[PDB]
Symmetry: C3
Subunit: 127 residues, 3 copies
């Protein structure tokens, strides 16, 4: 079959959020966060034509119990995405958009704190 | 000294493999990776191990994403200087395996990223 | 504006701890990390938080990997400039904790990687 491959230097983001909502499992909290992210990314895309996709992974975050962490860690989700040159024209505008969406997710999940990191990456995209 | 890690995201193609949970799809992808990595190692003598995580990938429903995201697996590995002599050959091998996984999982698109990393290996 | 993140991959040593699910092995590793980070913080005033993910690691069955991969946990953390003053001291502390985890989990081998990152922290 025919095939295409693109390679370029770009950025990926990674966000960590709590899961706060009456979910009963990591499978259920994955679906919860997935639905919320899908809605906020869609709203942004309608304004700017920039769609910020994310891969979401179940996790627990371990920190000092004296700052409120439960024993053995707090239930969290990790969201990761990339600026794919096929869909993204301007890396600075994309980065600004990711930061905006991170703050909105923090609000929707009613979180006190939230992290968002940018990491340099070499993206190969196969079709 | 620096080296490289790779990360791939793949779908699990329920339409074709008919897994019923994230536990089952994790095992499916784990077994497929094990087989393709072994086949490649027999050809090139380069064995590419991967750490695999369950996930869901959220994109625009108008491009076919299910509500709340598509079931996916994330595969991540590294060029460990204890086992790898030539980084360029390793990178070429990872790209080969990414394409093979895309084929085996019958995926329309697939991503493979390389990230610079400083590996400490304790034995 | 740059800092460092770490990522560790560890086995869960079913031979010794006998966990029955990925949920149970996540809590096991979580509790061990919490205790070793606390003990270190009391000595050095450096607290190393981690986000822990369930996973499997796929390698050659001829080196002892189970079919479809071995149950593992991935631990990832960052040097947050709001809490961390000296990156070299932090990195040394992470290495110490990685070795201690290797000991507590009775692992033959363990990896710890450092990756450059740009951290935004929202309060």
């Amino acid at each position: 079959a025919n095939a295409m491959a693109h390679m370029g230097k770009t950025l990926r983001f990674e966000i960590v959020s709590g899961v706060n909502f009456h979910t009963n499992s990591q499978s259920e909290s994955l679906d919860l966060v997935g639905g919320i992210w899908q809605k906020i990314a869609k709203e942004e895309f309608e304004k700017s034509n920039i769609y910020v996709s994310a891969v979401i992974k179940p996790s627990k975050t371990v920190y000092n119990q004296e700052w409120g962490c439960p024993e053995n860690g707090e239930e969290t989700v990790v969201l990761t995405g990339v600026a794919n040159e096929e869909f993204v024209d301007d890396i600075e505008k994309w980065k600004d958009t990711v930061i905006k969406l991170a703050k909105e997710l923090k609000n929707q999940m009613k979180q006190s704190t939230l992290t968002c990191e940018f990491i340099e990456t070499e993206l190969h995209y196969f079709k």
